[PDB]
Structure 1
Amino acid sequence: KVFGRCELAAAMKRHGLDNYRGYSLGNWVCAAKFESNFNTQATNRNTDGSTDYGILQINSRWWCNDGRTPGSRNLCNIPCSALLSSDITASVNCAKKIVSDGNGMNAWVAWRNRCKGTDVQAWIRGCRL
């Protein structure tokens, strides 16, 4: 599923991401834009052999199992394919565990380099939330 911007914002809000660990909804929409372009089916292989999955490009090195990232963990206790569903529940629950780690949203490289410090509220502008 390729979400609309406000559509994704509404879904993220409903699942309790808005202001989670202090990160406003626009930060999460911005992260999703530059991680996956709002496409739940997005996958990208990392140089180390891990793969990033879904709307928030969650990495198999630590967070989900894809059976082909030797020596990795599965801290969200979920198959990585579950992060490609049209229903973002799984991606949101896992993202909550990721951002609760010491580095907050800096764990998302695209957030740090393209969202951090910018006018992220623009990403929810005009949305009927």
Structure 2
Amino acid sequence: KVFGRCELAAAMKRHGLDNYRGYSLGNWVCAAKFESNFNTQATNRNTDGSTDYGILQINSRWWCNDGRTPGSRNLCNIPCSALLSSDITASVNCAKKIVSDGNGMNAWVAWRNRCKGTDVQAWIRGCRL
């Protein structure tokens, strides 16, 4: 599924991401935009052989099991393919564990490089939220 900007914002808010660990909703929408272009089916391989999955590009090195990342962890206790669903529940619940791990949203390279320190509230402007 390719989400619209306000559609995703509304769904993230319903799932409790707005101001989760202090990150306003615009941060999460900005992160999804530059991680996946709002596409739930996005995948990208990393140099170490792990793979990033879904709208928030969650990595198989730590967070999910894809059967092809030996020596890795599965801290969200899910198969990585669950992160590609049109239903973003699994992605959001796993993202809540990531952002809680001590590094905040700095865990997402695209957030630190393209969202942090910008006007992230612009990403929800015009939405009925």
Q: TM-score range by the shorter chain?
A: over 0.9
Q: Secondary structure at the match of 1:72?
A: coil
Report the Cα distance in structure 1 between the residues aligned to 2:29 and 2:63, rounded to whole angstroms: 20
Q: Secondary structure at the match of 1:118?
A: coil
How far is 1:52 from its partner?
A: 0.2
TM-score, normalised to structure 1's length? 1.00
Identity %, equivalent residues: 100
Report the Cα distance in structure 2 between the residues aligned to 1:102 and 1:15, rounded to whole angstroms: 21
Give 4+ residue runs of structure 1 displaced > 4 Å after superposition.
none
Alignment deviations for residues 89-118 of structure 1 (CA, whole Å, 9 cap, x no partner)? 000000000000110000000000000010
How far is 1:85 from its partner?
A: 0.1
How far is 1:66 from its partner?
A: 0.1
Report the Cα distance in structure 1 between the residues aligned to 2:118 and 2:75, rounded to whole angstroms: 30
Report the Cα distance in structure 1 between the residues aligned to 2:19 and 2:70, rounded to whole angstroms: 34
How far is 1:71 from its partner?
A: 0.6
In structure 1, list runs of 5 or more residues that go unmatched.
none
Report the Cα distance in structure 1 between the residues aligned to 2:4 and 2:128, rounded to whole angstroms: 13
Alignment deviations for residues 8-59 of structure 1 (CA, whole Å, 9 cap, x no partner)? 0000000000100000000000000000000000000000000000000000
Q: Secondary structure at the match of 1:111?
A: helix
Report the Cα distance in structure 1 between the residues aligned to 2:59 and 2:18, rounded to whole angstroms: 22
TM-score, normalised to structure 2's length? 1.00
Report the Cα distance in structure 1 between the residues aligned to 2:15 and 2:78, rounded to whole angstroms: 18
Report the Cα distance in structure 1 between the residues aligned to 2:107 and 2:120, rounded to whole angstroms: 17
Report the Cα distance in structure 1 between the residues aligned to 2:43 and 2:21, rounded to whole angstroms: 26
In structure 2, list runs of 5 or more residues that go unmatched.
none
Report the RMSD for the aligned CA atoms in angstroms: 0.3
Q: How many residues align?
A: 129
Q: Which residue of 2 aligns with 1:2?
A: 2
How far is 1:119 from its partner?
A: 0.1
Report the Cα distance in structure 2 between the residues aligned to 1:69 and 1:18, rounded to whole angstroms: 32
Q: Secondary structure at the match of 2:38?
A: coil
